[PDB]
Amino acid sequence: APIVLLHGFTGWGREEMFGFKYWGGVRGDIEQWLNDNGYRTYTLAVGPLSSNWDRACEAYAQLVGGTVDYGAAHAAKHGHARFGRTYPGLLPELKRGGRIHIIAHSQGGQTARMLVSLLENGSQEEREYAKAHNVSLSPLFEGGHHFVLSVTTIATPHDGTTLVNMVDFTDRFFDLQKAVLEAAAVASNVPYTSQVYDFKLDQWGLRRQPGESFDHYFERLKRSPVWTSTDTARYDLSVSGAEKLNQWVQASPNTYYLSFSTERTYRGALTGNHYPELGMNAFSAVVCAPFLGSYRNPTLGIDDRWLENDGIVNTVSMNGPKRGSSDRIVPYDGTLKKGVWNDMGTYNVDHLEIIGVDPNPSFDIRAFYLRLAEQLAS
Ligand SMILES: [Ca+2]
Ligand SMILES: [Zn+2]
């Protein structure tokens, strides 16, 4: 089965960002390493800020080909376009009984899980609405499709991240987007006339104008439904939103699930908080990690177990969905088990180091992805 790479709440296609890769960043090109070592690998690029639902509908069309269909019921409920972009299809073999391994980072792991759930079970709401209103139904919502062999998640907020609870989260989250642009040598205050980074917000009718800086565009997005509605990455990223997703997005017994967790902090002896390590990406170290390593909220069950983090996501959130979930999670024992989360361990690498967007010479990123690809091929 080929590997398909899937980004989180930042991420872009291989020709975007002047070729600086999300999967590899300053370290190289992970897809190229995998292909060069015999592991046939492709990359998806979906709306980074869009809901997991919208992203799963986009991923489906990107993989098999055709016009993105968000579901008549869903589009009506949230007030966005039902149909999106049209794709040629990266992998028409999936229409001929082929299967794929998905390797996903950050919120990509929520999207990958949801894509499996929709492939396997469809959506009863969409099936009923299509019957009631005499409209077409995407095959994604029928159920009985099985093309995902495995989902691997890396630093995924399966139970959310407490970052969303930060006082000025709206402004800091967009400053994070700017920090990632800067890592690619893309400035947030420059009036680019080429596309650079397409947020893929056709369903909401939003697009950056030529000559409009990312600073100015992001101020528009903050006030738009991709930030202010419940149909958003923002909603799904929160502890409450992730729990709601967990209530319906369950592990398929036909799919292998693997999780990798990340941590980049040390514990202070005096108040038990977690503090960022030397080498954490500067933005997380200064803006995000202090909060993540000290924020507790007893009424939500956010206790000391939540303080360890990788600069963006609480480490405890990453081994698999727990809150609101019935999925089982087991420590990897040398044999991958189907239908459950195989916890592949916790790595001392930060949220952006693990994809190479931030440097870390002590992390052999190439060996990490090659070892994972071997595990999936075996
Ligand atoms: Ca670093
Ligand atoms: Zn939507």
Ligand nearest to the CA of 203: 2
Cα 251 to Cα 55, 154, 206, 239, distances in angstroms: 18, 16, 34, 19
Into how many domains does the chain fold?
1
Structural domain range at position 232: 1-378
Query: How far is 366 from 224, CA to CA, in rounded Å?
Result: 39
Asked if residue 350 belongs to a known ligand binding site, the reply is no
Per the entry, the structure determination technique was: X-ray
168 marked among binding-site residues: no
| 83 strand-pairing partners | 69
Annotated ligand binding at 374? The verdict is no
Ligand 2 centroid to 160 CA: how many Å? 19
Ligand nearest the Cα of residue 53 is: 2
CA of 73 to the centre of ligand 2 (A): 10
Cα(359) to centroid of ligand 1, in Å?
Answer: 5
Does 359 belong to an annotated binding site?
yes
CATH of the domain at 73: 3.40.50.1820
Q: How far apart are CA 130 and CA 111, in angstroms?
A: 24
Distance CA 277, CA 266 (A): 6
> Residue 146 annotated as binding?
no
CA–CA dist 253, 360 (Å, integer): 37
Token pair listed for 241: 């939103």
> Which-ligand-closest: CA of 365?
1
155, two tokens: 């630093």
Alpha-carbon distance 204 to 226, whole Å? 8
Axis crossing angle, helix 108-121 with helix 52-64, rounded to the nearest 10 = 70
CA 158, CA 221: separation in Å to the nearest integer?
A: 25
* Separation of CA 122 and ligand 2 centre (Å): 16
Q: What is the 3-state secondary structure (H, E, C) of the chain?
A: CCEEEECCCCCCCCCCHHHCCCCCCCCCCHHHHHHHCCCCEEECCCCCCECHHHHHHHHHHHHHCEEEECCHHHHHHHCCCCEEEEECCCCHHHHCCCCEEEEEECCHHHHHHHHHHHHHHCCHHHHHHHHHHCCCCCHHHCCCCCCEEEEEEECCCCCCCHHHHCCCHHHHHHHHHHHHHHHCCCCCCCCCCCCCCCCCCHHHCCCCCCCCCHHHHHHHHHCCHHHHCCCEHHHHHCHHHHHHHHHHCCCCCCCEEEEEEECCEEECCCCCCEEECCCCCHHHHHHHHHHHCCCCEHHHCECHHHCCECCCCEHHHCCCCCCCCCCCEEECCCCCCECCEEEEEEECCCCCHHHCCCCCCCCCHHHHHHHHHHHHHC
- Resolution of the PDB structure in angstroms: 1.6
Q: Is 231 annotated as a binding residue?
A: yes
Residues with catalytic annotation? 106, 310, 351
Backbone angles phi, psi at 33, to 5 degrees: -55, -45
C-alpha–C-alpha distance, residues 316 and 305, integer Å = 7
- Distance (angstroms) between ligand 1 centre and the Cα of 234 equals 26
Kindly identify the ligand whose nearest atom is closest to the C-alpha of 82.
2
Q: Assign residue 135 a region (left: φ > 0; alpha: ψ between -120 and 50; beta: otherwise).
A: beta
223 Cβ partners below 8 Å, 6+ apart? none
Question: Ligand 1 centroid vs 280 CA: distance in angstroms?
Answer: 5
- The single-letter code of the amino acid at 211 is G
CA–CA gap between residue 97 and residue 356 (Å, rounded): 33
